[PDB]
Ligand binder design. Structure first.
Ligand SMILES: CCO/N=C/c1ccc(OCC[C@@H](C)CCN2CCN(c3ccncc3)C2=O)cc1
Ligand SMILES: CCO/N=C/c1ccc(OCC[C@@H](C)CCN2CCN(c3ccncc3)C2=O)cc1
Ligand SMILES: [Cl-]
Ligand SMILES: [Cl-]
Lengths: 286, 245, 97, 48, 245, 286, 245, 49
């Protein structure tokens, strides 16, 4: 050989129940000090009940299953309200195009933002009715328009031929429509936070709205209409619910503690910065 | 045997006689991208010692009223040494990092700095104060370069999230009575095996004085904080002409 | 190891003991340069005071790695971090840290 | 070159200036060759 | 099977359908420096594909009265791509080279170019004509950079030595009726295992029309000569700040 | 293995005599053509006598030993003439310092410049006498002053104490002094050509005299004097001869075909460029 | 385990809680003279514990402008205890020595003393300043006795030799922030197996402040330096009447 | 302070390659340093003076 120079301390465990407590007695000695720690290392304390007090034995059968990320997320929650009025400002044309973005509602958003990256399949349920909750015999069409596919421009656009895009035809009187959606990102996981820009070039203040936008999260358009060449006399409200399933999450982060202002960024109300915890008068009184 | 330490990589060596162990972010060491995860087909270039070495960025001055600072990776080095050059000439890049924040005082000074690594550190604005203006951070704030930037609202990390929970991220404390540095080894984290060193910052480094600096009049008042970092397992692909942004 | 005269100033000649050590002190500015000298062991300069420099002047050529050990003689209460660098041929004294 | 990485910090009661002694020598892979006379010694006058 | 050829290295590929074999200078292939010959102790950096690839320099125009041109290695690339950057950031450098000179005409043109590699190509001046002036070549002439320079007295190679004997050096001829290129693979040659890419040119490349170009009026008159080169086994050591000269 | 991508056609022969010639007859056929070549390849012709004509057998015993580089170079030749006059312009002080440079005389220089790199030991002989060739009883001292050692400044300089430098004391009436010198370069071989500069920095026309100067070839000073505190009444001429031995040469090059002008460079007389060969009137007549 | 130490010999014991190891001059321990090297035929006397014990000489005061001091062996003890008596009654003498220089301050003082042993420490004069006077050191300077003497030109050790090279001799540093003493064990060194304790000093001990003492006004200013020494393997021969010089 | 020289070597402070060093140490042997004749006396014996 002519040139010599050319030649994870963590594993998963199955913990179905909470740790038991072993009985301990008194310890009176030197050299050993479990109560003293050094938080500077970046590690959490390893002290346990038996190190600081005399304990009895407790056979703990308390389950740890409900805190599995799967059971935390697999509960359908509202992610969009699409209205289609008959008279007024909004689309009175009998059709609506909605760009898919699940960051419009707080409850579900705060739960997802607990993690940086998430990969999952989802079950979407479509609850439709009139603005006052009544139901009428109306035929509707829901169509998924992937990025790059022609978006319908009217109630009779050719796009509704849906020869390749997936469509769902259902009556407002039928039960809520429901379908399963796979993990569709071009990347290996969706990311609720993208500290960067989508393209190269200079980033002048005129295009600062690009910051934080990652195409890997842009899944396309969800189009809906009333099936017919004539206008429908009924106002329609579509509530979309998403249920995460077969989920995997990476990198936990601090939970949102300021009200949400916009879908596409973490901006907060600067003049009214809420304190994470409520306050009191003195530090020595409850 | 835990307070003393030496970090030697490339043609550089760091020493410290008052450390508090070392943190391996999420328990994983940096590593080159394996063939199962890779997608780009060209043979990567792995410069080794010319880019995986320690680089010392500008020093900051810790004052009794400092808010805190932050830097973004790999932005901080995109224009330094042979690392910067490879980052500019190649479209794709990936690597880990060894972060060593330094700060020494005397046995009479006091104060505690929280040094943390927050991946995908997206910043937010105060929305014009009232919250009716959908303003956005300027390029100079999202990617402050080697000089780093100052936090205006450390309590919410300038992003609507509680600083009190930042310890959920790889971190160390530099508590003056205990240690004079912090060391965190960070592996590559992304949803893709390689990425642009220019358009995307994988994580941000935050140095925040949670416990304000304090000392009696007469004691040295210039207490600097220096940041030294070293890329680890730096790989590059998609060669072409140099591009700064 | 023998003492290197890093502080070999013209204003020291009348009080030579002062050339045997150089100072460090509380700075108000950051990244300041404390001192600089060539590494050339057989060249006129600081190395001349070392037994190594004197002995290698009895030979025309030399080869090998050198070693410089710095001992801090301040008080026990003083602390600080210094960056000592060695720049290979090609670049003049580095402008900054 | 020797630079200040951080700063020389000291509490009240201690000198704000201290000194450093530099010691030098060769390592194990060091050798010399081609014996010659030195420049560091001359005989300006006679030695009585 | 000897006239057709493909040279693929790095992310670049060269093709030719009218070659005349390939020359391996002095019968030796380029190779990294072995531990027995090396003297510098630091671990070298061997960038591999980012620097060992084909680079195409400016094109020259062959006229009926051209004297000839020459380039110096590694000078020609000290300011190009990632190779240049490594050459500037490191004190020490060594490598071999694959030289591919290109020139095509038509079956009606005629002329012969002698393409040779002359190691340690030291230039001389005409000494003021009379020979009483001890003048010396300007930096722009000894190291012409990527643009290359023109010979003023090809017969004596601007150095008091007969061009008629240049064939004693690794070389090929580009005779228009036969081939349209020349390829020479050159190993590292020096009295030292590594050297400064800035202060020393290991060899010079000479392209000289020994048989003048000729063609009938009406035939294409723009007959260019292009030079494409590729470093091989490029190594670098003695890292520091960038230095251009 | 996680990452897969991370994993001389010439030999010496002993030819003591010239190649023999094998007897050959006539060859009359197609496909085979030894006479045709392609000089473009860069190769010399491989055609031999028997390929182009009918040959007889010749057992050739002609030796190839005299053309071995060793016998070509190991012949002492003049490389310096050092004079030391009593009255006049030059050193009338009784001592002379000569910087070692063997490029002052053509014969020996042209032979060395046939190669780019050369490594060797050498035998130096010192022939000394008066300018008219007569000899007188004069005691002389020759001293080798390596780079970095103090050069004598007078006839009584302390340097002549020669406590470490090697010195030779000899009479002008003794036979020529003679000594062996080793290969002293810091590099692996001396080089007659160095296409570069000795140091970094800008190379303005003011310092263009640096071009081609390689310290690896600068061996120091050769000092000589008459041994005595009083001036000698005799003029002295020292002729220095060098004999190369234990030599190795690399990279042959074109032989000098223009007169030499200077020691340190290849400059030639531009107005008088000699043709390598003599001329004639027509190309069709001798 | 390297900072704490105890030296017990004879009826004396020395302790220290802040040492910096111990030096064995030239790697050799003191030893009685063997029969192969000896030349004098009379049976020697080896008093043992009455002479191989620790003796404490006068204390010196370290000031901000002290030049340094020196003592000569065995001169310092020729008139102390039973050792002195044996040195006076016998013509021949030999022995080794354990030198323990003491000096403690506070964690707020600073300064460094170089403690070295220079065998055959021959002193020189300033030659009348101009250098035309061939003057010589007085008996009181060459053999200062137990009180020791002061250096007038520490830089040249009062002998035309550089203090910067004194570390080529067995030595230790007493750097106030690190240790409070120096210990050197010295074997017998001479060109003869035994010698006169009166006419010849085998070596001199030098204590020189290379880094001046310094402290803030208000801190203790009396910083003494004490020298304690112990003969080792002391032998004596050639008995007769007592002679002081 | 111990009085010992540093034991640190190239490989302890930087990343090194392998170097098979054949450099001789023979010329620095005290024998070759001293065994070179040098002047130690000039004795003159004048006729008048
Ligand atoms: C036949 C019609 O039925 N199709 C229904 C349907 C429903 C959802 C569809 O895609 C839903 C994509 C979501 C599972 C994930 C959307 N994401 C990914 C991450 N992301 C996001 C938003 C804002 N900032 C960062 C990330 C998103 O909004 C497509 C079709
Ligand atoms: C006791 C005194 O005897 N010593 C005699 C002596 C003779 C020659 C000595 O060194 C001779 C060196 C030569 C063998 C080689 C000189 N070289 C090496 C290459 N070189 C050169 C010159 C001009 N351009 C390029 C290279 C040279 O002139 C030293 C001492
Ligand atoms: Cl339809
Ligand atoms: Cl003499």
């Amino acid at each position: 050989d002519p040139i010599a120079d050319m030649i994870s301390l963590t594993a998963l465990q199955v913990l179905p129940t909470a740790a038991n407590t072993e009985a301990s007695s008194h310890r009176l000695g030197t050299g050993v000090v479990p109560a003293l720690q050094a938080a500077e290392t970046g590690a959490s304390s390893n002290a346990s009940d038996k190190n600081l007090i005399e304990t009895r034995c407790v056979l703990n059968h308390h389950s740890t299953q409900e805190t599995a990320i799967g059971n935390f997320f697999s509960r359908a929650g509202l992610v969009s309200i699409i209205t289609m009025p008959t008279t007024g400002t909004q689309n009175t044309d009998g059709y609506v195009n909605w760009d898919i973005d699940l960051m419009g509602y707080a409850q579900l958003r705060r739960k997802c933002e607990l993690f940086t990256y998430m990969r999952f399949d989802a079950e979407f349920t479509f609850v439709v009715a009139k603005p006052n909750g009544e139901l009428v015999p109306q035929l509707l069409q829901y169509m998924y328009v992937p990025p790059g596919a022609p978006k319908p421009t009217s109630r009779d656009s050719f796009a509704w031929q849906t020869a390749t895009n997936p469509s769902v035809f259902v009556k407002m009187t039928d039960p809520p429509a429901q379908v399963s959606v796979p993990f569709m990102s071009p990347a290996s996981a969706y990311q609720w936070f993208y500290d960067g820009y989508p393209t190269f070039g200079e980033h002048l203040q005129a295009n600062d709205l690009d910051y934080g936008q990652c195409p890997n999260n842009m899944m396309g358009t969800f189009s809906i209409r009333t099936v017919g060449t004539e206008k429908s006399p009924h106002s329609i409200t579509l509530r979309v619910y998403m249920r995460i399933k077969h989920v995997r999450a990476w990198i936990p982060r601090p939970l949102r503690n300021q009200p949400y202002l916009f879908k596409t960024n973490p901006n907060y109300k600067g003049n009214d910065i809420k304190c994470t915890s409520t306050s009191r008068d003195k530090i020595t009184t409850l | 045997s835990d307070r003393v330490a030496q970090l030697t990589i490339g043609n550089s060596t760091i020493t410290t006689q008052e450390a508090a162990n070392i943190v391996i972010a999420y328990g994983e060491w940096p590593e080159y991208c394996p063939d199962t995860d890779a997608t780009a087909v060209d043979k990567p270039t792995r410069p080794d010692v010319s880019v995986n070495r320690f680089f010392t960025l500008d020093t900051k001055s810790w004052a009794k009223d400092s808010k805190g600072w932050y830097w973004k990776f790999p932005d901080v080095l995109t224009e330094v040494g042979v690392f910067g050059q490879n980052a500019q000439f190649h479209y794709l890049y990936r690597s880990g990092f060894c972060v060593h924040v330094q700060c020494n005082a005397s046995k009479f000074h006091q104060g505690a700095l929280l040094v943390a690594v927050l991946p995908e550190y997206v910043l937010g604005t105060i929305a014009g104060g009232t919250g009716n203006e959908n303003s956005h951070p300027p390029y100079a704030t999202t990617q402050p370069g080697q000089v780093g930037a100052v936090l205006t609202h450390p309590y919410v990390l300038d992003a609507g999230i509680p600083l009190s929970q930042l310890t959920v991220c790889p971190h160390q404390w530099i508590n003056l009575r205990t240690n004079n540095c912090a060391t965190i080894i960070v592996p590559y984290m992304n949803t893709v095996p390689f990425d642009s060193a220019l358009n995307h910052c994988n994580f941000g480094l935050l140095v925040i004085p949670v416990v304000p600096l304090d000392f009696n009049a007469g004691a040295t008042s210039e207490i600097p904080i220096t940041v030294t970092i070293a890329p680890m397992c730096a790989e590059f692909a998609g060669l072409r002409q140099a591009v700064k942004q | 190891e023998t003492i290197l005269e890093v502080n070999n100033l013209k204003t020291n000649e009348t009080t030579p003991m002062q050339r045997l050590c150089f100072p460090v002190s509380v700075q108000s500015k950051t990244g300041e340069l404390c001192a600089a000298f060539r590494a050339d062991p057989g060249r006129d300069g600081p190395w001349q005071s070392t037994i190594l420099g004197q002995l290698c002047r009895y030979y025309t050529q030399w080869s090998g790695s050198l070693e410089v050990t710095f001992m801090f003689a301040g008080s026990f209460m003083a602390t600080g971090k210094m960056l000592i660098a060695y720049t290979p041929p090609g670049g003049n004294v580095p402008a900054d840290r | 070159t020797i630079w200040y990485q951080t700063n020389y910090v000291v509490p009240i009661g201690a000198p704000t200036t201290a000194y450093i002694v530099a010691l030098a020598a060769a390592q194990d892979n060091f050798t010399m060759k081609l014996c010659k006379d030195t420049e560091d010694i001359e005989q300006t006058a006679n030695i009585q």
